[PDB]
């Protein structure tokens, strides 16, 4: 029956995300989405009894890296939205890696694992953009970026997190597929049109 496969099969919603991120020269972000696609697939593959036989690492590892991978995918998407220069880019990328690694270890299932990154990312983004709005005396990312990346990306972000943290209580089988799909579209829509630092 389809409900066995649907949580595993819907993990391939990130395959568009990695394909698009690679085409836009976001080669690091493409790793983090590809890594997440792999560990989210095998995290669900072990749980479903009828295909649990195929997966080859212990539940502890695939569980950790499905959560960590997702939380870091949100982080590198948001640290790609706010383009930073080399010393700040490399620092803030690594700040996410080290924070999310500890957060995923310390309380694996707690909403803190996503709240920490999304809160810190939003603070870093908003402080950079408010400084740039004060410098230019105008809406810094053009209205075109707000209406076609930030607005849609965060709209899918709210949808994904409300599917995960509310409506997963009503059903797991279809809602967790809608979650994989919704969140894969946030990781597409939050990315800029080109990786400017690729030159």
């Amino acid at each position, epitope marked *: 029956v389809a409900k066995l496969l649907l949580p595993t099969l819907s993990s391939l919603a990130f395959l568009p995300t990695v394909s698009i991120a690679t085409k836009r020269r976001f080669y690091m972000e493409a790793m983090v989405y590809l890594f997440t696609m792999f560990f989210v697939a095998f995290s669900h593959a072990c749980d479903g009894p009828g295909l649990s036989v195929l997966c080859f690492m212990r539940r502890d590892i695939l569980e950790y890296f499905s959560i960590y991978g997702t939380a870091l995918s949100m982080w590198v998407s948001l640290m790609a939205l706010a383009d930073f220069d080399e010393p700040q880019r490399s620092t803030f990328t690594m700040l996410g890696v080290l924070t999310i690694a500890v957060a995923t270890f310390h309380d694996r299932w707690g909403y803190g694992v996503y709240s920490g990154p999304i809160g810190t990312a939003t603070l870093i983004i908003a402080v950079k953009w408010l400084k740039k709005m004060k410098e230019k005396k*105008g809406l810094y990312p*053009d209205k075109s970026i707000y209406t076609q990346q930030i607005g849609p990306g965060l709209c899918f972000g709210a949808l994904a997190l409300m599917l995960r943290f509310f409506f997963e209580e009503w059903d797991y089988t279809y809602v967790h597929s809608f979650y994989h799909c919704a969140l894969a579209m946030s990781f597409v829509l939050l990315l800029p049109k080109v990786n400017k630092k690729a030159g």
Partner: antibody
Amino acid sequence: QVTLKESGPGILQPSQTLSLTCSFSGFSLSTSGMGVSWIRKPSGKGLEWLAHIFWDDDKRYNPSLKSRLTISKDTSSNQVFLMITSIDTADTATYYCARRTWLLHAMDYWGQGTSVTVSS
Amino acid sequence: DIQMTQSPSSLSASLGGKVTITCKASQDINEYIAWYQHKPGKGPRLLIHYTSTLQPGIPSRFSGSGSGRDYSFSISNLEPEDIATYYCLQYDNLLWTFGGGTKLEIK
């Protein structure tokens, strides 16, 4: 509607200071994030930006000429005033004033533009 | 301030033909170009207020493209109303800088 109109002396001597005045309607420079700009076409040249004045009374001048521009504003009449000092034959130009917004930073309404010539 | 060059200083184009203007900036200006139609004896009109974003009430023939130091302005099947002088404005810095302007003429 949005409108701006440029008024000044037109014909005058070199080695003098001229007053250029911009009057506007459909908006007020008292509005949050609003700005008025001054720009001129020198005779047969490409366009040259001169000055900005903003809702917050912040001001900006062209580095090539900044020693001889003084911008100012009046939100009671809805007017903006620019003075060019020590005027010279290079200032034989059409002068324009234009409304910059907050949502998009490039000016989106220009006035009709007014001729300036300095001669004996 | 960042100097810009519009490649053609003047263009001769057929009524109902395509025409394009290339603008080259002296530095990367982060897609903050706007394109203006200066019809002689009148104040300029804003056509495009980012690299590609048209102003509302502008006919769909007008379009722009390019990114980082090289941008293009385009008209598809131009009308006799479109005969004007066309300027690009760099507006990345508050030190606003124009190109030299392109005088389009009917063939």
